[PDB]
Ligand SMILES: *[C@@H]1O[C@H](CO)[C@@H](O)[C@H](O)[C@H]1NC(C)=O
Ligand SMILES: *[C@@H]1O[C@H](CO)[C@@H](O)[C@H](O)[C@H]1NC(C)=O
Ligand SMILES: *[C@@H]1O[C@H](CO)[C@@H](O)[C@H](O)[C@H]1NC(C)=O
Ligand SMILES: *[C@@H]1O[C@H](CO)[C@@H](O)[C@H](O)[C@H]1NC(C)=O
Ligand SMILES: *[C@@H]1O[C@H](CO)[C@@H](O)[C@H](O)[C@H]1NC(C)=O
Ligand SMILES: *[C@@H]1O[C@H](CO)[C@@H](O)[C@H](O)[C@H]1NC(C)=O
Ligand SMILES: *[C@@H]1O[C@H](CO)[C@@H](O)[C@H](O)[C@H]1NC(C)=O
Ligand SMILES: *[C@@H]1O[C@H](CO)[C@@H](O)[C@H](O)[C@H]1NC(C)=O
Ligand SMILES: *[C@@H]1O[C@H](CO)[C@@H](O)[C@H](O)[C@H]1NC(C)=O
Ligand SMILES: *[C@@H]1O[C@H](CO)[C@@H](O)[C@H](O)[C@H]1NC(C)=O
Ligand SMILES: *[C@@H]1O[C@H](CO)[C@@H](O)[C@H](O)[C@H]1NC(C)=O
């Protein structure tokens with residue numbers, strides 16, 4: 004009370020100092036069962052990409068994607084992320100990604 | 103979907119295509135387990151408000167703590183409508199309201215000098231002997247001069263922005 | 270169509286014509302007055318951030334806005350408490366009604382509490398309460414004076430009124446029969462006490478009929494308490510808007526702080542957190558400003574209600590159209606959710622009659638002016654009656670006073686005064 | 690503690706001024722809260738944005754302060770109107786409004802100057818030492834009703850007297866302070882008595 008009132012004397016009355024809040028004990032990482040690692044050797048390590056006006060769009064779903072092995076490979080010049088961060092992406096589940 | 107809360111069971115019936123869920127205020131209160139098909143219920147963590155009922159520091163340093171919107175189980179003990187007051191005792195008497203707690207409960211520092219919690223009294227219990235042939239005519243009087251203070255004005259201040267914002 | 274301002278009446282004005290009423294009617298009205306609102310306490314930090322230390326560290330860079338809003342809300346709560354504390358708690362001793370309830374013929378069954386139901390409000394107050402019917406940082410604080418305490422205050426006020434009149438508001442309550450109390454109420458508006466002492470039965474019947482009509486109207490319709498319902502709806506809409514303002518992006522990527530923290534790194538998410546904080550703070554400041562304006566309006570209404578209580582329930586106000594349309598007689602407060610209801614018992618006139626009047630009369634060369642009343646005629650004879658009730662009395666020397674000769678008064682009849 | 694409202698107004702004004710002064714210590718997201726330090730350490734490009742953010746923050750704070758000051762000024766205007774009404778109705782006259790100037794029958798008031806306020810000394814008339822009596826609506830002497838003009842018919846147990854309403858002063862029931870209206874079988878509560886004729 005003396006800290007929230009910024010003084011050393013307190014008169015008779017009721018003062019709302021702070022609030023109560025239970026702290027969490029542990030954390031869960033509940034995720035579904037997924038296999039069939041998404042093939043990145045055909046999207047990146049392909050024979051030859053198409054032209055700019057005829058870019059190839061390939062839908063990929065029902066897989067598990069590891070985005071850390073791409074940035075840490077030190078083989079990509081630019082790895083700019085928009086809307087998301089270069090990290091904190093291996094802990095999220097996407098609905099439908101494109102390439 | 104991340105966050106914190108008490109994952110308890112529920113009674114609502116999620117449709118086969120429905121996975122997540124919301125409430126009246128568009129707040130997620132129930133989701134589905136990714137592994138199994140059990141319908142959970144995201145109950146928010148326990149939290150509320152804390153109020154410190156204390157007398158003047160010149161009198162004593164004994165204080166009390168009131169937890170607002172709790173059920174005496176989320177934290178000598180008193181279950182009130184405003185909350186659960188831990189630090190005072192519930193007496194059966196009734197005095198004037200010194201420290202308004204809420205819902206009629208009032209706290210005061212009385213003697214064994216401790217903090218008590220009682221119900222405020224609305225005044226004395228008087229009963230006029232009303233009858234069809236009874237009147238009470240006064241036989242004396244007493245002139246009483248009372249005081250009444252009302253503010254008329256305040257300090258005339260003036261804040262120049264061209265000197266406050268940009269010095 | 271075009272709204273009509275009212276009926277088209279043409280008063281037959283004349284310098285020798287007067288309309289004195291020959292009857293009356295007791296008409297009890299109803300007035301709704303808000304006294305207080307719901308005491309809310311919006312947690313600034315929990316509303317802006319919601320259990321986020323990274324967001325709190327950025328919110329701390331905006332100054333003492335959190336403390337300012339908390340102090341404003343606390344002041345609003347204390348003000349809403351003191352409003353009802355000054356409106357209802359205007360009596361020191363809690364009076365009670367005697368067991369033998371025979372108030373000269375008046376029936377206060379639905380007004381006074383009854384032991385048939387549990388310890389709660391009376392029948393009319395229960396009807397009023399029945400007709401007016403833990404969050405993301407927005408908690409609700411309970412009022413200090415509970416509904417039972419407000420009901421006990423209203424019952425004590427009713428008992429003190431019925432048993433004393435206005436003597437309980439200036440010191441110690443003085444016992445007095447309700448018949449003599451009504452006689453004093455009538456004498457306070459000019460009407461003599463013999464009218465009441467002769468038509469007490471009719472007046473009690475009219476009062477009971479008015480109370481029954483009020484009860485039937487309150488049981489039939491529910492929009493009678495419009496102001497309280499409007500205040501409740503405004504508060505609920507303000508709270509709902511303040512809650513829904515958390516679903517807006519305010520230019521950020523999303524409105525979910527935890528999702529933003531899980532997706533973007535802190536360096537890039539700092540700007541999004543700042544934008545969300547600015548938006549939520551602007552919304553909360555707008556809410557606090559509107560709440561302060563509404564609290565000032567409610568304080569004005571509560572001051573008006575306390576004035577109308579002190580000057581009309583603890584006494585008899587002589588102000589026109591202040592505590593009832595008509596000649597005010599008495600009033601009874603009734604409890605209401607976040608408000609107060611008054612039963613303004615007024616003295617309304619009835620069918621009048623045309624007579625012939627004169628400013629004075631001259632008997633022996635001197636002008637005789639009416640001391641208390643007015644000179645009226647029925648075509649052949651002249652009588653001095655009251656101003657609000659037709660009671661023809663013989664014009665004697667004890668009812669009029671002589672002041673000068675009858676040569677300067679513009680208009681005077683040559684009547685014949687009677688010397689007892 | 691008598692001038693509690695005045696002390697509270699002064700404290701609220703002082704707290705508002707102190708908060709308005711202290712709001713200059715926050716940067717509102719800027720690098721620093723010192724405008725001169727920012728201008729001396731940064732180039733004009735970034736200094737423009739820093740000054741814009743500081744101006745936005747300080748303008749929001751000043752607008753909040755002005756809004757609160759307007760609310761308090763409206764409250765003070767209402768209080769001053771009430772005080773002027775009480776002055777005009779109790780110091781320049783005798784108010785008949787119940788509980789308007791003192792708790793009791795208002796007699797007179799005396800104004801007293803106070804810092805940013807006014808103090809009234811409401812002189813009231815509070816009755817005391819009340820005694821129980823037996824009252825009656827009217828009396829009948831010769832078959833005609835008798836109602837008192839101004840007073841109440843009270844009896845000490847054996848004799849009926851007419852006294853004032855706010856002060857016990859018994860007087861013999863005469864025809865001067867009593868009028869006749871009606872009969873003795875239309876009033877509920879008639880009491881047979883003898884009216885004296887001077
Ligand atoms: C999913 O995987 C877990 C181990 O990761 C395994 O125990 C479980 O049987 C699998 N199937 C289901 C339906 O959970
Ligand atoms: C693709 O080629 C890179 C070489 O830059 C190699 O590191 C990587 O393992 C290969 N496969 C995939 C799936 O990226
Ligand atoms: C479904 O609705 C019925 C009534 O419409 C209700 O009785 C039942 O409890 C509900 N079931 C739920 C909410 O699971
Ligand atoms: C919670 O508070 C209520 C209110 O009195 C009480 O009746 C109840 O026993 C408490 N505990 C639980 C588990 O409900
Ligand atoms: C009336 O009360 C006063 C005290 O206020 C006292 O001095 C006086 O004697 C009393 N008069 C009677 C008649 O009792
Ligand atoms: C007579 O009284 C009636 C109302 O009872 C009124 O409408 C009418 O104008 C009066 N006439 C005269 C001549 O006073
Ligand atoms: C006066 O009006 C009432 C109705 O409120 C009626 O009962 C009564 O008979 C009337 N009196 C006269 C004298 O007409
Ligand atoms: C008063 O009215 C109620 C209902 O309106 C009735 O039950 C009661 O008997 C009445 N009182 C008397 C004394 O008749
Ligand atoms: C007027 O009243 C008197 C007495 O009340 C009566 O004698 C007289 O006949 C009345 N005149 C008319 C025109 O009604
Ligand atoms: C009253 O009005 C009538 C009608 O106009 C007129 O003849 C008479 O002189 C007036 N009397 C007075 C005293 O004005
Ligand atoms: C009243 O009498 C006087 C004196 O005789 C006379 O002048 C006057 O006209 C009379 N008034 C009326 C209305 O007849």
Ligand SMILES: *[C@@H]1O[C@H](CO)[C@@H](O)[C@H](O)[C@H]1NC(C)=O
Nearest residue numbers: 230231238818819820821822
């Ligand atoms: C009047 O009667 C009441 C109750 O009957 C009693 O309390 C009071 O003392 C009496 N007063 C006098 C002066 O006898």
Ligand SMILES: *[C@@H]1O[C@H](CO)[C@@H](O)[C@H](O)[C@H]1NC(C)=O
Nearest residue numbers: 844845846847848849850859
């Ligand atoms: C009432 O007053 C009269 C007049 O003074 C007196 O004669 C009589 O004895 C008194 N009675 C009582 C009971 O005091």
Ligand SMILES: *[C@@H]1O[C@H](CO)[C@@H](O)[C@H](O)[C@H]1NC(C)=O
Nearest residue numbers: 233234235369371373877878
């Ligand atoms: C006055 O009340 C008493 C007590 O109930 C009763 O006996 C008496 O008849 C009543 N008198 C009148 C006129 O109502």
Ligand SMILES: *[C@@H]1O[C@H](CO)[C@@H](O)[C@H](O)[C@H]1NC(C)=O
Nearest residue numbers: 829832873878879880881882
């Ligand atoms: C008053 O006198 C009349 C005369 O007949 C009588 O009928 C009546 O009962 C008397 N009053 C009382 C209260 O005795």
